Design a protein around this ligand. Structure first.
Ligand SMILES: [Ca+2]
Length: 323
């Protein structure tokens, strides 16, 4: 748990923390959340929704969605509690909880999530239990505004799992059985409208149980945090238009966009046009200066890892996990 989050979580209601299921949804840099609308898919008792409530502040909004009746009951019980805690009055909540399948946010109760209404969609380990991944990614694309991002952690494989592995109930329940091969994931989210997948962090996921392991013998599983921006002008490729971007400060000493792009305060960093357009059209434009496009110069190479930058997603992940 990040240090900045500890103080906030210490103010969240015991019952919310005690009954919260799963790992916390990882969040973009705290300062970048100010005034944003955040949607947590699979919100449970609302631990992450309440954490985000404080971070987005009074001008931001947070929405949680879940289909677990009894978790949502807990979440809804504490709307006033956390409005008092964070904003000085029980009437000043910026959160709401909706009941629905994450594969159809338009039919959630008591209200659906509108088109183009959300800045950041967050989630942890929800995909591999989804009954329809493509439908889910399409829904996420629909609710995001232009410049918004899906910033999420899930489990992926370095190869395609066998049918036997995909049918196993213990692997299923562990979020392993439903894991996609990283290249299949890339193609699926591209079909949904997400043209550029950025790797934020990656850790290994072990399957040591010998019985289960026999179903996935040489598979390497990874926990990956990706950010996928909805930006109309993105291309499938990372092209050089001679641009630089400079982080202006205000939301940390540096801004780390992904494993390839770190922006020190007030220093220019050369960027490909997709990265430029992400900064310009997303909420990040508030803290950045991005130079004008020049003539196309070909593929972007002005990065100390440019070869990996253009490599398949499996190569980025395997090489960045460690060593
Ligand atoms: Ca969750």
């Amino acid at each position: 748990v990040p240090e900045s989050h500890r103080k906030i979580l210490a103010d969240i209601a015991d019952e919310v923390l005690e009954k919260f299921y799963g790992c916390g949804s990882t969040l973009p840099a705290d300062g970048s959340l100010e005034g944003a609308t955040v949607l947590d898919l699979g919100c449970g008792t609302g631990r992450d929704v309440y954490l985000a409530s404080k971070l987005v502040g009074e001008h931001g909004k947070v929405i949680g969605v879940d289909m677990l009746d009894n978790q949502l009951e807990v979440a809804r019980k504490y709307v006033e509690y956390h409005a008092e805690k964070f904003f000085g009055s029980p009437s000043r909540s910026n959160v709401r909880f909706l009941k629905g399948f994450i594969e159809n946010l338009a039919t959630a109760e008591p209200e659906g999530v509108p088109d183009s209404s959300v800045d950041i969609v967050i989630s942890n380990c929800v995909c591999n239990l989804s009954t329809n991944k493509l439908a889910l990614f399409k829904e996420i694309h629909r609710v995001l505004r232009d410049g918004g991002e899906l910033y999420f952690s899930d489990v992926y494989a370095d190869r395609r799992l066998s049918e036997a592995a995909q049918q196993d109930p213990i692997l299923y329940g562990e979020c392993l059985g439903g894991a996609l091969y990283l290249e299949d994931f890339r193609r699926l989210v591209a079909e949904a409208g997400f043209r550029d997948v950025r790797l934020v962090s990656v850790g290994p996921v072990d399957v040591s149980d010998p019985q289960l392991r026999k179903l996935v013998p040489d598979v390497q599983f990874y926990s990956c945090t990706f950010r996928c921006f909805k930006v109309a002008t993105l291309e499938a490729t990372r092209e050089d238009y001679g641009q630089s971007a400079t982080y202006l400060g205000g939301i940390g000493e540096e801004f780390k966009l992904d494993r390839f792009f770190t922006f020190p305060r007030e220093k220019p960093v050369r960027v490909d046009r997709n990265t430029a357009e992400i900064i310009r059209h997303s909420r990040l434009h508030q803290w950045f200066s991005v130079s004008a496009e020049q003539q196309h110069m070909g593929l972007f190479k002005a990065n100390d890892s440019y070869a990996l930058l253009h490599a398949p997603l499996s190569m980025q992940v395997e090489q960045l996990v460690s060593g």
